[PDB]
Amino acid sequence: GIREKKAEYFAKLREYLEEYKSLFVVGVDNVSSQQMHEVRKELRGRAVVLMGKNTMVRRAIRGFLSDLPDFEKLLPFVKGYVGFVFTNEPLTEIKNVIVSNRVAAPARAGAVAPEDIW
Amino acid sequence: TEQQIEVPEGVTVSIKSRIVKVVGPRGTLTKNLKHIDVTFTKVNNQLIKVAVHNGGRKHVAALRTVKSLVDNMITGVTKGYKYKMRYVYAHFPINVNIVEKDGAKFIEVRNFLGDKKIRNVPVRDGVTIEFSTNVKDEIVLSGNSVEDVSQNAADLQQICRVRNKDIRKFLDGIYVSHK
Amino acid sequence: RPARCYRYQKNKPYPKSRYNRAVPDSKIRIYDLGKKKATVDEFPLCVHLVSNELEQLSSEALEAARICANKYMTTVSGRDAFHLRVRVHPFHVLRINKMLSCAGADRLQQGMRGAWGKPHGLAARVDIGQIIFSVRTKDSNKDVVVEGLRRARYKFPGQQKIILS
Amino acid sequence: VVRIKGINKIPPKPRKVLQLLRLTRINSGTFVKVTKATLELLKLIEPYVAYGYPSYSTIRQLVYKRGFGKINKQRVPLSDNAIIEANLGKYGILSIDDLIHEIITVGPHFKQANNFLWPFKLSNPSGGWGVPRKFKHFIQGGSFGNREEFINKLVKSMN
Amino acid sequence: VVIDGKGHLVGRLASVVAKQLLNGQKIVVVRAEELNISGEFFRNKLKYHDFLRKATAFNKTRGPFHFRAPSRIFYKALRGMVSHKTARGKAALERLKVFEGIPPPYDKKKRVVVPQALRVLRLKPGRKYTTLGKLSTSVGWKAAAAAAAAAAAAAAAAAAAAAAAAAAAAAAAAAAAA
RNA sequence: UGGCUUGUGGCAGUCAAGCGUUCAUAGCGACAUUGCUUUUUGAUUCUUCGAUGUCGGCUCUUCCUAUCAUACCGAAGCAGA
RNA sequence: UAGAGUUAAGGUGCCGGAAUACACGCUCAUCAACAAAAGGUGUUAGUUCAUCUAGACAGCCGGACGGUGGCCAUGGAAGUCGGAAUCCGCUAAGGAGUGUGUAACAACUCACCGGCCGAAUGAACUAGCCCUGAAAAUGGAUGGCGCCAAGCGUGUUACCUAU
RNA sequence: CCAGCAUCAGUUUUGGUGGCAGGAUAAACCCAUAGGAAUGUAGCUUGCCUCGGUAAGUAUUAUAGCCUGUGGGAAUACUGC
């Protein structure tokens, strides 16, 4: 598994996260077909709701450092089948539509502009 | 290399040459445990430690397994394993008596296929074979050992394997369910 | 005579058009196959089935290897990306003795006297360095003749060393 | 020069060049020439007759016990006086050290002119031949070729 | 010279015995069954020198006679070394008789004092190897008490040593207590 | 006659493209070869003229399994059979 | 023609005289004791390279998405026939697809890929010991005893050796 | 009368052990001193996580590679005794 892929992987997430402000970890706690894309269509523009291997993005949020801190206290949110959502489509609009669809199997929480919310 | 295996409060391990004993409330089980060079007679209070100097493919085999079977003997003598089979039959009602009353260290299968005869096998050590609740398909072994417990799966399976008529069509056969 | 007994050669050369009282017919159907066109054009890759030995590859097995590989290379295409050759010919007419018999016979047919191997077969010589089954095949993707050189050396006596050319 | 291989089993190509050595059975060895002539001799009969570079002491013990004439059995054994002086006298070589510094240097005389035999009968080497015998020549580890250092104690046994 | 054939290989004892018998020295070997020949139980099964296929039913009228016992192996084996052919050979054969069991109760050259070789160590060496007192069982070898009992006889010999033995020991002990 | 080779050739491994309903190997197998082997069927005067008398069968004196049937086992494109 | 002095060709576990020696090493199958096409998780070493805390790899655990039955062979073709375009989607992953399944839908699984875990793993290339291919008839019948080193290579040493 | 073999005393020839030396040479079983490059073990201190350890400083506890300069060691292939 080539490191030229993985190096530009965690580096790209840094650039996207420096550009944005807020974070919120998604809870993918067992789905069913159509309910995946029913999340996605309520966002649409520039959000972050794909997936991608956790070990790579574990390195991204650790080796962040925009000012002085990284994404502190983020690791107790992200373990198991989990996700993120950030980038530039407006803030609260992105945030509430995750937990529009995901009220059946709900989503988690995360630090919004980093003020810690749980 | 060398590995470590502990022993809890109400269990006493005692290896003494290759002869091992693990003690528990179900029974106390003996096997042997010693390959080439490897000395497992190193009792460091609680920790019984296997240790060898050499390595190699077939040699590393008897480094791990002597470590494994003392952990498996403590689970055997304390808790007790449950190895799982089922009596299956096609048409004819397969009839079984267990190691209690009639069975004096033997189990029996009669009316296997179309038997007027009987196919008989003994049983091993101190295995308390738990056949049925009221009536069940499942026979389930349990005893003080690990080896001798599921040896009563071997006993029972081989003696009435579907040989003289086909296994494919005729479904009188006591097959294994899972380990 | 299997091709075990069409291996070596104390059969010495004899092959000219002037001095010959007529050869028999051969099996040999076609030389170059797959591509006629591309020798080294489409094919910068080759495998030569280079002899270790100084054998006669008899005309029996010569057609055999070539026709197995002919029938095979129709699935991929009947003119796929290979160029299976025949090179060195049965120039030499293979001399083979018998009907023979000393005493107690039709006319007497000898063997010792009557040393002349009365021309029966045909054989090519495929000596050291030389090959018949030169397979100029393609660079990327479809190389098929590495497989088809098991199928070449089988219908050939001897232990040929596979060299990339 | 020495001799290693036996009397038998010699084709007419070795048989010609063995002729004017005048050498019968095994071990016995003559004193050959050295100019260009030595090359063609130890080219053909290289695996028959071996050679090497001996010292001064190496061919000193040799002409003592194996101290021959041609004609007449030897009265006085071969000292310095037994060559030149003594009762009668031979040619006129002085010591055994003058006899070695005769032949090895340039060789102004052959041994028949000094009134000895044409070859000299030697011995077998004490310490043996063994693996350095028939098997190969010098660069592997053989009897044949130019044994430079090794021919010292070898011929201080064959003496 | 009396030795003991106990707890080592068979051939690397037989060889050592032969050079001792050479002149006419009266070497008796005591125990054959507690030796060890090698081989499998598969290849070394069918064609083996007890009863299975070969050397038992292995005779004519004027012809061979073999064995089906772990006692008779070592007796037949050391005609098969020192033959009856030469005059010293047949003489040297009579100097040797092998015994099953240990009829001498005393300790001669046995375990600690023996010649070289013999007691091979199997570690990296040796998965498969037989034992003569296993191999001969379903060959016609019974009657264990008779031969196997011999061990019981060897025991009573030990006993004779241990006596009086025990006495001189108890004494020897008091000697050093001093 | 015996020896030798296996010529003339038998058997198997097997290159496995074809073709059998789809489908390299239930089966059928273009094209043939490599090792083994000594059976179809013979090449050779090696070893033999003070004997080298034949075939089918009766009768009675062996050993091996390249295996028909009896003990034991497994699989199918075989419903029990 | 004879007794000594020295050694070849070649031997020393034993029949039957001489090391049950010394040093290092793969391997212990009694290898040693014939055999090709053609083939292998025994078992060891060297070289080059994919691969690696920029989270290697396995097992266990998931997301199996919207456009959508993409399009077209064809009687029908359905991701799932043949052949080409080669994406959008949501831009921390799902290709216009790794394998199964029904004429086919109906049904199912997943490389690609996700999530636990946390260190050297894996392709080639080259060499050696092993290992598979190998059937016949009188009593060991590929040694008598038998040997796991008393086999063999490489390096060394001692003893024996032709009139 | 040749070969085997012969009292008793003295000596040669050939090879080795053991002690010693020359040709000719200096590595060693193991040999000085000064300056610069290096980097191993014990002990102490400081920092951080965790109950088990690790990183940094340590020339200021103790010791070394390899080169350069100066100075000092040095029995043996061959050959003889």
CA distance B65 to chain E (A): 18
E strands in D13-66: 51-52
How far does the CA of C97 sit from the C1' of F49, in Å?
33
How far does the CA of D149 sit from the C1' of H67, in Å?
38
Most distant CA pair in chain C, distance: 67
Distance from C-alpha of C6 to C-alpha of C9, rounded to nearest angstrom = 8
Does the CB of C63 sit below 7 A from strand F?
yes
CA dihedral B118, B122, B127, B130 (to 10 degrees): 0
Q: Work out the burial of residue D75: count CB atoms within 10 Å of its CB; fewer than 13 is exposed, 13-18 middle, 19 or more buried.
A: exposed
Contact indicator for D31, D110 with CB cutoff of 8 Å: yes
Total residue length of chain E? 178
Residue nearest the C1' of G17 (CA based): E19
Which tokens sit at B127? 């295995």
Positions on chain H within 7 A of a protein C-beta = 13-15, 77-80
Quick one: CA dihedral B131, B133, B134, B137, positive or negative? negative
Which tokens sit at E84? 């009856």
Distance from C-alpha of B57 to C-alpha of B47, rounded to nearest angstrom = 26
Bridge-partner residues for B96, per DSSP?
Answer: B109
Q: Which of A118, A27, A106 is nearest to A74 (CA)?
A: A118
In E124-153, the residues whose Cβ lies within 8 Å of chain B are 124
Task: Return the H-helix or E-strand segment holding C126.
Answer: strand C123-126
Distance from C-alpha of E166 to C-alpha of E65, rounded to nearest angstrom = 47
Distance from C-alpha of D146 to C-alpha of D46, rounded to nearest angstrom = 10
Q: Which of B56, B12, B21, B14 is nearest to B35 (CA)?
A: B56
Experimental method: cryo-EM
Which tokens sit at B67? 């470590």
Contacts of residue B162, defined as CB under 8 A and 6 or more positions apart, other chains included, come to B113, B170, B172, B173
Distance from C-alpha of D27 to C-alpha of D119, rounded to nearest angstrom = 10
Contact indicator for D64, D95 with CB cutoff of 8 Å: no
Distance from C-alpha of C107 to C-alpha of C101, rounded to nearest angstrom = 10
Using the 8-state DSSP alphabet, how is residue D143 labeled? S
Q: Which of E150, E18, E28 is nearest to E83 (CA)?
A: E18
Residues with CB under 7 A from strand H: D 55, 57-58, 60-61, 64-65, 126, 149, 152-153, 156-157, 159
Which residue in the block uniquely carries the two structure tokens 């050479």?
E22
Task: Look up residue C56 and give its amino acid.
Answer: Q
Contacts of E124 in chain B (CB under 8 A): 36
CA dihedral C73, C78, C81, C84 (to 10 degrees): 60
How far does the CA of C99 sit from the C1' of F56, in Å?
34
CA distance B110 to chain E (A): 34
DSSP output for C76-108 = S-TT-S-EE---S---SPPP---S-BSSSSSS-
CB atoms within 10 A of CB E59: 11
Which residue in the block uniquely carries the two structure tokens 């530039």?
A88
Buried/exposed E103-114: b ≥16 CB within 10 Å, e otherwise: ebbeeeebeeeb
Buried/exposed C40-55: b ≥16 CB within 10 Å, e otherwise: eebbebbbbbbbeeeb
Which tokens sit at D141? 């580890």
Distance from C-alpha of E98 to C-alpha of E77, rounded to nearest angstrom = 11
Strands E98-99 and E29-30: parallel
Q: How many CB pairs lie under 8 A apart between chains B and E? A: 3
Kindly list the distances between the CA atom of residue C25 and the CA atoms of B64, C20, C88, C119, in Å, as whole numbers in the listed order. 72, 14, 17, 11
Across all strands, nucleotide nearest E83 (CA–C1')? G15
E strands in B25-75: 28-32, 43-44, 47-51
Phi and psi torsions of E131, nearest 5°: -150, 140
Using the 8-state DSSP alphabet, how is residue C124 labeled? E
Contact indicator for E1, E30 with CB cutoff of 8 Å: no
Which residue in the block uniquely carries the two structure tokens 């299976």?
C84
Bridge-partner residues for C162, per DSSP?
Answer: C49
Task: Look up residue C76 and give its amino acid.
Answer: V
Bridge-partner residues for C124, per DSSP?
Answer: C57
- Label each residue of chain E as H, E or C: CCCCCCCCCCHHHHHHHHHHHCCCCCCCEECCCCCCCCCCCCHHHHCCCCCCCCCCCCCCCCCCCCCCCCCCHHHHHCCCCCCCCCHHHHHHHHHCCEECCCCCCCCCCCCCCCCCCCCCCCCCCCCCCCCHHHHCCCCCCCCHHHHHCHHHHHHHHHHHHHHHHHHHHHHHHHHHHC
Alpha helices in chain C (DSSP H): 59-72, 150-153
Using the 8-state DSSP alphabet, how is residue B39 labeled? B
Which tokens sit at B115? 């038997």
Residue E58 CA, distance from chain mean position: 24
CA distance E120 to chain B (A): 15
Bridge-partner residues for B122, per DSSP?
Answer: B106
Which residue in the block uniquely carries the two structure tokens 């063997």?
C111
Contact indicator for E38, E77 with CB cutoff of 8 Å: no
Distance from C-alpha of B116 to C-alpha of B119, rounded to nearest angstrom = 10
Contacts of residue E91, defined as CB under 8 A and 6 or more positions apart, other chains included, come to E24
Positions on chain F within 7 A of a protein C-beta = 6-9, 14-18, 30-35, 42-45, 72-76, 78-81
Instruction: Decide: helix, strand or coil at residue D82.
Output: helix
- Label each residue of A44-90 as H, E or C: CCCCCCCCCCHHHHHHHHHCCCCCCCCCCCCCCCCCCCECCCCCCCC
Q: Which of C75, C8, C51 is nearest to C152 (CA)?
A: C51
Distance from C-alpha of B51 to C-alpha of B41, rounded to nearest angstrom = 9
